[PDB]
Amino acid sequence: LICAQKFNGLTVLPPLLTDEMIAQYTSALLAGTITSGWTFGAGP
Amino acid sequence: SVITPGTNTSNQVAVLYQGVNCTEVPVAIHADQLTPTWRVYSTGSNVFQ
Ligand SMILES: *[C@@H]1O[C@H](CO)[C@@H](O)[C@H](O)[C@H]1NC(C)=O
Ligand SMILES: *[C@@H]1O[C@H](CO)[C@@H](O)[C@H](O)[C@H]1NC(C)=O
Numbered sequence: 001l002i003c004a005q006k007f008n009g010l011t012v013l014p015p016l017l018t019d020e021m022i023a024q025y026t027s028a029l030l031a032g033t034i035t036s037g038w039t040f041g042a043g044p
Numbered sequence: 045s046v047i048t049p050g051t052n053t054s055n056q057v058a059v060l061y062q063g064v065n066c067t068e069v070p071v072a073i074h075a076d077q078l079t080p081t082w083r084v085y086s087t088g089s090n091v092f093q
Contacts, residue, residue, distance in 0.1 A: 011063045
């Protein structure tokens with residue numbers, strides 16, 4: 001298991017961007033695309 | 045791992061014991077129990093799990 005790696009120094013570093021914030025970024029992208037077309041990707 | 049703003053700015057640093065539920069054993073470091081010494085920070089400025 002994941003803990004089994006934690007006996008002999010095989011530590012797993014958690015990602016900086018948690019899945020919640022990845023979902024937040026994806027929701028921001030979706031809102032931008034829906035309510036702004038492609039303009040938001042090239043300026044305001 | 046040691047969090048530092050890079051000598052230049054300030055020598056004050058903060059450390060991070062990765063991958064440990066430190067609310068038990070490292071927050072309760074006794075005399076020279078923590079690896080990098082300076083047992084003065086047994087409680088430290090703040091211990092944030
Ligand atoms: C770095 O150190 C130099 C010399 O002491 C100083 O002039 C400079 O402002 C410092 N920069 C920072 C970001 O601490
Ligand atoms: C971390 O330690 C605290 C205090 O013993 C405990 O309440 C908590 O459940 C622990 N968490 C994990 C993930 O082991």
